[PDB]
Design a binder for this molecule. Structure first.
Ligand SMILES: c1nc(N2CCNCC2)c2cc[nH]c2n1
Length: 330
């Protein structure tokens, strides 16, 4: 049944992967409300789609700046991945379009903010609460890896909490469709697997290491490897020593020791049994996997009807088309 679901999901993905979506919608169809985040070559705004009244998060990217920072192909690959994937815990890309100045990606609005912010506000989660969130990541990585996608950007900041208290994964900035090995040093230091830091190639197993870090951080209220200098963080990561808080259950420690396995060939999620070594672990014994997928489990936290404040700026669109041919495939 899981095998049957994933086989169908692979077919669905490849159809969209090989034949991308047509350009939909225009700027004036959305009322601009508030800036939700800013970056070097773009910003994300809370918008209301006028005709439906639906609220969305619109990513506005400055074309000239994308071209300047050599981010053309990165932008296109990221869009291509977003429009092709379909899973409950991945943010829906609703519309994409472009004008003379900007590229626009209109995504599902996730109102409850980042898990980072939730951790900053409430501290460590109980093991049952950590397990609720962990279960959604497991199923998400199961789905993504079945499509040969490595995520390689798991961190609390990239996990947004929806009105039902469920995770919506944003930021496909480092996501890569790869069969076999790759080498790029990308991602936040705290969450990097030893094989990313070291000169050797890596595969999808890096996502499972990152899951180990996330579960540790949720249950402890701090990351397993931290220091002021990234090099010092790396030294701790490669060394293979983790200190577990005294309140960590035996089941939690065993799962974490197997996820935070320095030898990628011995790491849970990367053995012959695959995801089942994680899903069937004693720590996940109480987890109803179907119920999590269907979002039928009551969440630990429902956001109040969450984001940090940013200064507002109007969308300026030039009367002359910028970088037209460069973004033809967008
Ligand atoms: C267990 N069950 C799953 N379902 C929910 C019930 N209908 C079939 C698909 C999925 C989907 C991804 N991973 C899963 N693990």
């Amino acid at each position: 049944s899981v095998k049957e679901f994933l086989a169908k999901a692979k077919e669905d993905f490849l159809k969209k992967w090989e034949s991308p979506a047509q350009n939909t919608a225009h700027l004036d169809q959305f009322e601009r409300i508030k800036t939700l985040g800013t970056g070097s070559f773009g910003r994300v705004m809370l918008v209301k789609h006028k005709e439906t009244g639906n609220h969305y998060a619109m990513k506005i990217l400055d074309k000239q700046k994308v071209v300047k920072l050599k981010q053309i192909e990165h932008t296109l690959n990221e869009k291509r991945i977003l429009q092709a994937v379909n899973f409950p815990f991945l943010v829906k890309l609703e519309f994409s379009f472009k004008d003379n100045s900007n590229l626009y990606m209109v995504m599902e609005y996730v109102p409850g903010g980042e898990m980072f912010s939730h951790l900053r506000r409430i501290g460590r989660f109980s093991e049952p609460h950590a397990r609720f969130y962990a279960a959604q990541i497991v199923l998400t990585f199961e789905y993504l890896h079945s499509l040969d996608l490595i995520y390689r950007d798991l961190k609390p900041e990239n996990l947004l909490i929806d009105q039902q208290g469920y995770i919506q994964v944003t930021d496909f900035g480092f996501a890569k469709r790869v069969k076999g090995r790759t080498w790029t040093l990308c991602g936040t230091p705290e969450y990097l697997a030893p094989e990313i830091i070291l000169s050797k190639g890596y595969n999808k197993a890096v996502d499972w290491w990152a899951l180990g870090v996330l579960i540790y951080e949720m249950a402890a209220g701090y990351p397993p490897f931290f220091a002021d200098q990234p090099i010092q963080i790396y030294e701790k990561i490669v060394s293979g020593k983790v200190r577990f808080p005294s309140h960590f259950s035996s089941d939690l420690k065993d799962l974490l020791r197997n996820l935070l396995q320095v030898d990628l060939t011995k790491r849970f999620g990367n053995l012959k049994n695959g995801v089942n070594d994680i899903k069937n672990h004693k720590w996940f014994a109480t987890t109803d996997w179907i119920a999590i997928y269907q979002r039928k489990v009551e969440a630990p936290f429902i956001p109040k009807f969450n984001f940090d404040d940013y200064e507002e700026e109007e969308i300026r669109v030039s009367i002359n088309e910028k970088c037209g041919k460069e973004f033809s495939e967008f």
